[PDB]
């Protein structure tokens, strides 16, 4: 919340637990399935229907997790991706997840990123982005991706950030439709 | 911290955020923002600062600076800190919430693609920049892939855009940062 000497975004209990419990999820769908559990927990904790987590790309070690905390956190920048990337950087002691000596990091996200989070992914040093719900799915429940540049996926790829989309899309869409209805 | 994202502010930036201040003219607002750039460079930060003001009264709401490298946080651009600190102070994620004064972000340089999106989501209704994108790309910063006519994109959303305000002073500070950012000791820095 508001502090004179910091920007401070608190985490709800499920998300503190996510960021402190040891967890290694080797398979891509295992990583996304866990991210989807975080989506449902986040909704129960008064946040938006979006979650993300940074994993070591090869082992599947969970480094950090984030969810949308925009309304309860009074912070429009508190998208899942921003929280996950920033909490991973804090844990690993560097702004640059591609720094020498760090293993390759991947951001596994419940939905394709908005233009803000597209920029955050570029600056973060992650080497891979894996998304479930597509941009059109997000827009079709009333969330705005904003004016991304033309060929934003190619923009990531040109910078050495691989992009995969549609992973457990149907499961992510079940949670999004449930949210929208409620 | 195990239970929060926590971006500490250096003492000068705490001082900036604590003291009531009213700056009416655009040049007055930007002059203050550029003071924060110089203080930030002296505190190991990047040569960037920004502040949210009440657009029509000049009251300072919050200030932010680039704390990316010392704060170990690639999202800790000046604009993200200023907008987020203003939201925390005003107790809302939306700086255009009903009842709030129209807010303006005054920033030392044109925003990168991340901060461009943050400006859209923030609720500010005016963006005022000093250094141009080409100025910052010339000292090795990257603005990243913004959409074509990003300025027009802001304007269409009812966010006015002004750029080049006190550009010469902002350029002088960028060149200063560039001359002092290396490893060989230079006592003049
Ligand atoms: Na791909
Ligand atoms: Zn986003
Ligand atoms: Zn930026």
The answer to whether A51 and A94 are in contact (CB under 8 A) is no
Say if residues A53 and A31 touch (Cβ distance below 8 Å): yes
The end-to-end CA distance of chain A, in Å, is: 27
> Which stretches of B43-127 are DSSP H helices?
78-90, 113-122
| d(C-alpha A109, C-alpha A165), whole Å | 10
User: Which positions ≥6 away from B174 have C-beta within 8 Å?
Assistant: B47, B109, B131, B135, B136, B139
Token couple for B177: 């940062």
Neighbours of ion ligand 1 (CB under 5 A): A 163
Residue B131 CA to residue B169 CA, distance in Å, equals: 9
Considering the four listed CATH numbers 3.40.1180.10, 3.20.20.70, 3.90.1300.10, 3.40.140.10, the one that applies to the domain covering A1-182 is: 3.40.140.10
Answer whether A8 sits within 8 Å of B4, measured CB to CB.
Answer: yes
Quick one: how far is CA B6 from the chain centroid?
A: 18
The residue with tokens 């803000």 is A116
The upper half-sphere exposure of residue A81, i.e. CA atoms within 13 Å in the direction of its Cβ, equals: 29
CB atoms within 10 A of CB B53: 32
Interrupted after residues, chain B (C–N over 2.5 Å):
none
Strands (E), B4-125: 4-8, 49-54, 60-65, 103-109
**Alpha carbon B55 to chain centroid, angstroms:** 15
B112 contacts A116? CB cut-off 8 A = no
- Bridge partners, A66 (sequence order): A52
In angstroms, what is the C-alpha Rg of chain A?
15
Query: Where do the structural domains in chain B lie, given as residue ranges?
Result: 9-181
**Residue A149: φ, ψ to 5°:** -65, 160
Q: Which residue has the tokens 């990337």?
A: A85
| B5: β partners | A9
> What is the Å distance from ligand 3's center to B3 Cα?
25
Rounded to whole angstroms, the Cα distance separating B46 from B7 reads 15
DSSP 3-state of B6:
strand
Residue A22, both tokens = 């040891």
With a CB cutoff of 8 Å and minimum separation 6, the contacts of B58 are: B22, B23, B24, B25, B28, B29
- Classify the phi-psi angles of B149: left when phi > 0, otherwise alpha if psi is within -120 to 50, otherwise beta: left
Q: C-alpha A121: how far from its chain's center? A: 9
- B142 is an annotated ligand-binding site residue: yes
Contacts (Cβ under 8 Å, ≥6 apart) of A20: B2
Residues near A115 by beta carbon (within 8 Å), at least 6 away in sequence:
A145, A146, A147, A148, A152, B113, B116, B117, B120, B147
Element at B18 (helix H, strand E): helix B11-18
Beta-sheet pairing, A128-133 with A105-111:
parallel
Which residues does chain B have within 8 Å of residue A74's beta carbon, measured at their own beta carbons? 87-88, 91-93
Residue B87's nearest CA partner among A70, A12, A122 is A70
Tell me the DSSP string of chain A. Answer: --BTTEEEEE--HHHHHHHHS--B--SHHHHHHHHHHHHHHHHHTT--S-EEEEEETTT-BEEEEEE--TTTTT-TT--HHHHHHHHHHHHHT-S-TTSTTSPPEEEEEEEPPPHHHHHHHHHH--SEEEEEE-HHHHHTTT-----PPTTHHHHHHHTT-EEE--TTHHHHHHHHHHHHH-
Q: Do A90 and B145 touch (CB under 8 A)?
A: no
Fold of B9-181: Cytidine Deaminase; domain 2 (3.40.140)
């Amino acid at each position: 919340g508001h502090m004179n000497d910091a920007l401070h975004i608190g985490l709800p209990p499920f998300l503190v637990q996510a960021n402190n419990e040891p967890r290694v999820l080797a398979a891509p769908e295992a990583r996304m399935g866990y991210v989807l559990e975080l989506v449902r927990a986040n909704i129960a904790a008064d946040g938006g229907p979006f979650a993300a987590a940074v994993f070591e790309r090869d082992s599947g070690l969970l480094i950090a997790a984030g969810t949308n905390r925009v309304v309860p956190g009074r912070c429009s920048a508190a998208h899942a991706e921003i929280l996950a990337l920033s909490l991973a950087q804090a844990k690993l002691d560097t702004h640059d997840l591609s720094a020498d000596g760090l293993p390759a990091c991947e951001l596994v996200t419940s939905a394709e990123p908005c233009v803000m989070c597209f920029g955050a992914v570029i600056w973060s040093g992650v080497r891979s982005l894996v998304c479930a719900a597509r941009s059109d799915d997000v827009e079709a429940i009333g969330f705005d991706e904003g004016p991304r540049p033309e060929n934003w996926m190619g923009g990531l790829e040109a910078r050495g950030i691989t992009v995969t989309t549609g992973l457990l899309r149907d499961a992510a869409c079940a949670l999004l439709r449930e949210y929208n209805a409620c």
